[PDB]
Amino acid sequence: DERIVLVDNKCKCARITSRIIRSSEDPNEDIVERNIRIIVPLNNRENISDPTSPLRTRFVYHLSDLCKKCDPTEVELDNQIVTATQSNICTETCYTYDRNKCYTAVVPLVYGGETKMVETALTPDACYP
Amino acid sequence: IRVFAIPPSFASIFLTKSTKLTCLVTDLTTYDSVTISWTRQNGEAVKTHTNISESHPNATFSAVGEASICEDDWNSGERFTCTVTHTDLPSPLKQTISRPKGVALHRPDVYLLPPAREQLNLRESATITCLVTGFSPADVFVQWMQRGQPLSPEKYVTSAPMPEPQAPGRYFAHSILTVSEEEWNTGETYTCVVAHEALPNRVTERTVDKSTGKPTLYNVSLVMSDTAGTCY
Amino acid sequence: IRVFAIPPSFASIFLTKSTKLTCLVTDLTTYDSVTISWTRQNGEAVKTHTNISESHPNATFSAVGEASICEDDWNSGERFTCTVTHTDLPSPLKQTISRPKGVALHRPDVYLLPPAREQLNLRESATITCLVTGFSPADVFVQWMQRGQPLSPEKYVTSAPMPEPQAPGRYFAHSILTVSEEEWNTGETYTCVVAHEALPNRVTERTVDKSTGKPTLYNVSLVMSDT
Ligand SMILES: *[C@@H]1O[C@H](CO)[C@@H](O[C@@H]2O[C@H](CO)[C@@H](O)[C@H](O)[C@H]2NC(C)=O)[C@H](O)[C@H]1NC(C)=O
C-alpha cells in the first residue's frame, strides 16, 4: 500500500518499486528508496524457442531500457485532442517464459516410414489449443 | 495353432488416420487352407485382405490380415471377432477384442534422469531414462531423437504399462536409451517425445544434455548498467 | 488328468531359505485316491506333506505336494522325480526334473538414480530407480530397505527380465519405488539389494540419499557499472 509499482517486466522478471519514508520530522530530510528484484533462471537456454540452443551463462540488465514508456497518450488543449509521444528512445531478448503466452515447436515424427511433423508444447502446461 | 489379435493403437489413428484390425495367426503348417475374416455383432460381412509371409525356421507359417474399419466401429466399443478357419482345426478359433468404457482422461507427466555418476567412470556407455507416469488408458508412444534427427527403432527399448500401487487408475512406463561415452561427453542433446490423447496439443517433448541435469558446478555472470537512468 | 512338476526359482530359494519341491496335479475327480512321493537318484521314498486345495467350480480338484530337501544336492546334478498314483489312471505318471547345467554366468551391475528435481519442485512425490543390467540367466531377486528394516511389497514394483538388443546374451531389469517428497526431504536413506547366483556372495547393496548429486562449485560474479 505504501509502495508504487513502476515496471513489472516478465521476460527479465524485473520489478521496481519506489517509496518515500518520513525519516525524522524535517520535510527536507526524507530519503527516496528504489528497490529492484530480479529472478534469474539457471536452466533455460539462449533461445527459448529452440531446445538445441546452448546454455546461457551471461545476463545483462540495462535499467534505462526497462523503465521506458512507449504508448501515445491523449492530451486536451481546450480546442482539440491530440496524441503525444511519451519518450523518443522508443528485438529484446526474453530470458524467462510468460504464463500469459504459449510456446510451440515443430518436430519430425517417423512411424512406418512416413514422417508427420506435429506442433509441440515446450512449456509444461501454459495455454490449451 | 494360436491366434493373436491386436486392436488398433492411438498412434496409428493419429499418424495414419485409418483404423485397422489385425488378427495374426501363427503355428500354421499349410498356407493353402487358411482364411482370415472379420464378422460384426449383427453378422455384416467385413472385407479382409489376407497376406502370406515367408517360411519360419521352425516349420511354421504366419498369415497377416489387414482390414479397413471406421474409427467409430472401434471407438463405439462395438465388439469385433476375427474368424480363422483351418483344415487341421475341428472348430474355428474365435478371439474377442473390445475397448472398455468408464475411463476418465488424465494428463501424463514426463521426467528424464541423467546417467549415473559412477557409470561414466568406467568409460563404456551411458544410459538415459524417460519416465512417464500418471495416465489412463494404457496406450503410449515414446520416440527418441538426437538434435532433430529421429533415432533408429533399435537403440531404445520400451516397457508395457503397469498399474501404479499407490494411486489406482494411473499407470506408468519408461524408455531406456544407450549412448557412447564420448558422444555424451561431447555435449550432444537428446529429446523424449510422447504421444497420448490426454495432452492438449497431444504431443510433448523434453530435452536434456550434459550441462543440464545433475551438473558439477554453476557458472553465472551478471551485469547491471544504467542504474541511475530516467524512470519518470 | 494333467501333471505339472515345476522346479522352484531363485526367488523362492532366497525368500523361504529352504528348497521346497512341488508336484501339483490338477483336474482330479477324487483327491481321496491321490498319492505324492518324490524319489532321489537311489529311488528312496520322500516325506511329502500332501495338501488339499479348495473345490473348483468345474468339479475339479487338485493335490499339492510339498517336500523339503537340502539345497546342496540340487546343484550337483541330481534328477528328482515324483510318482503320482490315481484310480482313474491305469499307470502312474512320472515327471523327471533337474537343474540345467552349462549356463553362462555374468556379474550384474547395480545403479541407483535419485528423483528428478522438476518432480520434487511440485512438492507431491518422489520416485527412485534401481537399474540392474549385464547379467545372465534370468534369475534376479531385488528388495528395498529403509534404515535397516524391510518395507511391504505394495510400495515398490519390479519388472521381468528383457533381452538387451545391444549385447547378445545379456538381460536387464528395473524396480520403481514411491517416496513422499517431505519424507525424502527429511534426510532418510534407502537401500536396494540385488540377489543373483553369479555374484560371489549372492548379495549386493546400493544406497542413495537426499544429498546425492549436490553441486560442488557455485562460481558467481556481479558487475555494477553506473554508466
Ligand atoms: C529462436 O528460435 C526461433 C524459432 O525457431 C527462431 O525463429 C524462427 O525461425 C524460423 C526460420 O528459421 C521460422 O520458420 C519461424 O517462424 C521463426 N519463429 C517465429 C516465432 O517467428 C529465431 O530466429 C531463433 N533466434 C535465434 C537468435 O536463433
Ligand SMILES: *[C@@H]1O[C@H](CO)[C@@H](O)[C@H](O)[C@H]1NC(C)=O
Ligand atoms: C569463474 O569465472 C571465471 C571468469 O570470471 C572463469 O575463468 C572460471 O572458469 C569460472 N569458474 C568456473 C568453475 O567455471
